[PDB]
Design a binder for this molecule. Structure first.
Ligand SMILES: [Cu+2]
Ligand SMILES: [Cu+2]
Lengths: 621, 621
């Protein structure tokens, strides 16, 4: 059995069993995170050891633990009690979603805030929002959420239309206490609804959209074996799934003639953070680590054929653990299919008389998740020509506020009285590289402009320069779109037939990075977002750019501490961390539900192959 | 009849007739360019005047002329003899393709160059290459082409595989003279072939690609009326076609309820230039103005159903003039269809219980052209949500050279002895804007970072600043990807329901602009390429960023001279010229035929609509 296979339901139950027998999962315990670990380097030969790692919350106030078990051997490998004031709180539990509203409903300061606004407490939804780390010393070591109110005029109303500004509350989830209720002033609660299925607001639905039928009459060109192993148009890989990261891709390789050549050992979105840019004390603390704090895999949608995923779809239904260690299946939580992708290569040659046209295809592996108001589609594409791509599709409902009467430098207007604060959605792709194997390096490549003169008399020449990143202390890089900057991962010990090192070139979109002041809390907690590209030496415990426990962690953790080890990355097992994000100044067209907007990156072969790798593509039927 | 309808065959014949009767098209005359002119501003009401503009070459050495005729009225509106030494030579004629080889075949200096290399003159193909303007005073006023040799080992061989380096020749096309033959040294003629249909090099073709069937069982959702008028999912526009520019889009508008709101009056690629970066005197002169020198519309491919254009395709077969004024149909030279485009908007709301998913579509209008070794697909997309996009798909066979033995700072290696010089492919999109009508302005929008402190105590705030471009002297702008710079075209007299000016935001890719030294010939002839965005006041004779006659024109013409008029562009009929390009350092995978690579831009509504414009999209069948 492939040691990269998906966790099965029986594997989760065995973790539950091992923890129970070990005395680690009594009735007061809640699993906040559970996931299989990747096989260790070199273990390929031989003998399974499927290890699972668990974060265990205790609802009685006892200390939480990090536990690794061996489902293979039925043992506890490690169990450590965590001092959350130092190393962070556990991830948010799904069971804590409703607690913030429930505690506030009977708090007299909250009820007073709502009475001044003539709002019925029974119609006041409270978003359970991650707290971060600011000035409130009582919160250190405590599991806090913060709450912002949204009025639901009726049970199928969109509360996002009716933010209650000037009001925020903090609660201690464990002790079940409201620690602070801040009311800075009354704002009108925007009156319009945002119900995008209401015929009054949609108007009569269009009748003009004729059907588009996409079918594969002989079925798809990719095979799935071993539960999650894909073979498609020379690509080979395994599709993993982790409750924190979502879909992960393992062992991406390309059959080049008779050789299976590795390209990327592990590909994941290791963090995704939404910083807000509104300096109001009602929201100036909000930074939602969708991945590290909430666990995006956990909230993956079940994707409906014909509507969520069109064409000939093959699904995976990954398993996760519920809060008590029982397996739960996410039905149709991963969609897989191949698509047409236009012209691959075309040339009509006058001299030879030959006219040639070939079509491209891509393999698509995706999931869609929902974190409160946000919805994101994570898409990995593999193309016939070797190009690898990632794309995020950001949609959902924008996070709202009041629109101040004097306007705002940090908030857009969507509807009368309704604002939407400025924010970014910033991702980190963790690419554990394996270009032709693990001995890799990274070069930064800039265009070079040349001055007209001797050896360049007509002033037309231009060139490129590549700079090797030799050690981690040199591997924190920024974009330079003006100089066409890219980063090439090569194998300096593997040369193509032209005696040049095989490589792949990372093409970024060069969007703005984290805008927050460098002295801010979020710049410290999300340092990775402040730079476009990081290279580290591989290490099995360096998994997320933000560290293991993001929630209410003071800062510094993660990449800035990994990098300080100043390890050799010049022909070594290395990891590329690419920051990329969307800067979102909301527009009216984003309201009441926003059209998808996208961000991502791609890697293209750069002398990896001896010549084009798609010459064996046949003329289309 | 819509005055934006395509030229018909009868219209071309009537031009021929009018010129013949007027004494302007005797047997020594060759039409180098012919195209309908756009209706003048305000002529909507009323009465046709279909005017055509013609550039007439004279093969006897008499001066060429620029002529505008009225096919409506059967008259010559204007005819002016051109002093090509001042205002430029005419565009390259298709009939001149073979002349460069034919003249050189019997020239003793050329034959000597080839004999030293043991090449059979009968197997030596010569690319007819535009000359530009350099140090050769004898060329001023003369119609010159330059030639580079490529060996074809047999009639169906790819000559690009066998460049003959160290050798270039210049010829006077009219006098039929070889003006110079420069032989700077012998290089090996690369030996490998590049025949991508040869089973020896492709290997056995793949059998793994299962079929993908895309159909529309009730036909497409767009209608074509009046020959070229498209109605699709609230969009309205006309598809034009000009032999120089290719597909042009007129009168792009969006039905918003009961109003037809204009967005863009005219959209075209007004120039496309390929500068080379190899300082060798054999190629340091090459800069191929595919649009302005060669006329891309002229070489549009006939696009084959199922292979070039998949799905339910509606074609236009535009008409052009041959060199004698006879109409010629480009069969299936424009493909039109709609496609699925993934998720449009999705949200799964916990509080309201509603789960919502809608799919996107785009309308696609494209053509594909071949200029020697290059092939380009020009694609215009319209999306349901109002986004407009352009994409170029660059493929074909890379222009080759020898690979020097000591390597090269300006040339990649593709195969033993085979080089491909560095180059860029730089486009200019001419967008004659009409945001809600003609009274428009442009603002440059940058992200603003804020310093932590008073009014921003937690250091999270960020904002934006918009700078109006008031006059043409302020409207030459450059990218700043780091600050998320975009440009917003608004109508300062048309406000959405929130009292904010309607607009569209141009999202560029922020690729490098022209790399050549600012003092170089190409920087002067292609000044537009040196900056990302230009705004001019509309004027009916300001059509191309490079002027009317690009071929062998000394420089300065075009945008830098338009801009100097310093006209008011703050709430006026304006035109946005966006430079965008690909910088191409060829890779081994580009050889022997290159996979498509892409570049483009998009515009997104920015407060143009009162709320999302796709709320009336129905749940998919
Ligand atoms: Cu957003
Ligand atoms: Cu190129």
């Amino acid at each position: 059995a492939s040691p990269f296979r998906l966790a099965s339901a029986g594997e989760i139950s065995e973790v539950q069993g091992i923890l129970r027998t070990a005395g680690l999962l009594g009735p007061e315990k809640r699993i906040a995170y559970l996931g299989v670990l990747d096989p260790a380097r070199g273990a390929g030969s031989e003998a399974e050891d499927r290890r699972f790692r668990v974060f265990i919350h205790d609802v009685s106030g006892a200390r939480p633990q990090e536990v690794t078990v061996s489902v293979t051997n039925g043992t506890v490998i490690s169990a450590v009690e965590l001092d959350t004031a130092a190393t962070g709180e556990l991830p948010v539990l799904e069971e804590e979603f409703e607690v913030v509203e429930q505690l506030l409903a009977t708090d007299e300061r909250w009820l007073k805030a709502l009475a001044a606004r003539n709002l019925d407490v029974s119609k006041v939804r409270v978003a359970p929002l991650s707290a971060g780390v600011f000035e409130y010393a009582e919160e250190r070591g405590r599991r806090i959420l913060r709450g912002l109110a949204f009025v639901q005029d009726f049970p199928e109303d969109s509360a996002w239309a009716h933010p209650v500004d000037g009001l925020v509350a903090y609660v201690d989830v464990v002790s079940k206490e409201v620690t602070r209720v801040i009311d800075t002033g009354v704002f009108p609660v925007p009156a319009e609804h945002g119900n995008y299925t209401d015929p009054e607001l949609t108007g009569p639905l269009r009748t003009t959209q004729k059907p588009i039928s996409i079918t594969q009459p002989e079925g798809p060109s990719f095979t799935v074996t071993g539960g999650n192993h894909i073979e498609w148009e020379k690509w080979s890989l395994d599709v993993g799934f982790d409750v924190r990261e979502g879909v992960v891709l393992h062992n991406i390789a390309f059959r080049d003639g008779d050789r299976l050549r590795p390209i990327i050992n592990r590909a994941s979105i290791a963090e995704m953070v939404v910083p807000y840019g509104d300096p109001s004390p009602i929201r100036s603390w909000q930074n939602y680590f969708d991945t590290g704090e909430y666990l995006v895999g956990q909230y993956a949608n079940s994707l409906e054929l014909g509507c969520d995923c069109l064409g000939d779809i093959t699904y995976l239904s990954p398993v996760i653990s519920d809060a008590f260690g029982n397996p739960r299946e996410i039905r149709n939580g991963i969609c897989m299919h191949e698509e047409d992708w236009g012209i691959l290569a075309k040339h009509s040659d006058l001299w030879s008389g030959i006219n040639y046209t070939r079509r491209n295809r891509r393999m698509v592996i995706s999931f869609f998740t929902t974190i409160g108001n946000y919805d994101y589609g994570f898409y990995w594409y593999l193309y016939l020509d070797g190009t690898i791509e990632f794309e995020a599709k950001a949609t959902g409902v924008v996070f709202t506020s009041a629109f101040p009467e004097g306007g705002s430098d940090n908030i857009s207007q969507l509807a009368p009285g309704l604002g939407a604060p400025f924010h970014q959605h910033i991702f980190s792709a963790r690419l554990d590289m394996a270009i032709d194997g693990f001995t890799n390096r990274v070069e930064e490549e800039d265009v070079v402009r040349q001055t007209m003169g001797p050896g360049n008399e007509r002033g037309n020449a231009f060139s490129r320069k590549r700079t090797v990143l030799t050690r981690e202390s040199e591997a924190v890089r920024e974009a330079d779109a003006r100089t066409g900057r890219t980063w090439i991962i090569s194998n300096p010990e593997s040369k193509n037939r032209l005696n040049e090192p095989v490589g792949y070139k990372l093409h970024a979109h060069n969007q703005p990075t984290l805008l927050a002041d460098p002295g801010s809390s979020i710049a410290r907690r999300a340092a990775f977002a402040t730079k476009d590209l990081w290279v580290t030496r591989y290490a099995d415990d360096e998994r997320y750019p933000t560290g293991d426990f993001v929630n209410q962690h003071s800062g510094g953790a993660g990449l800035p501490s990994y990098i300080a080890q100043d390890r050799d990355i010049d022909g070594q097992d290395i990891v590329v961390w690419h920051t990329f994000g969307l800067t979102h100044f909301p527009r009216v067209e984003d309201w009441p539900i926003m059209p998808v907007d996208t961000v991502g990156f791609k890697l293209r072969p750069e002398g990896f192959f001896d010549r084009s790798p798609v010459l064996d593509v046949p003329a289309n039927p």
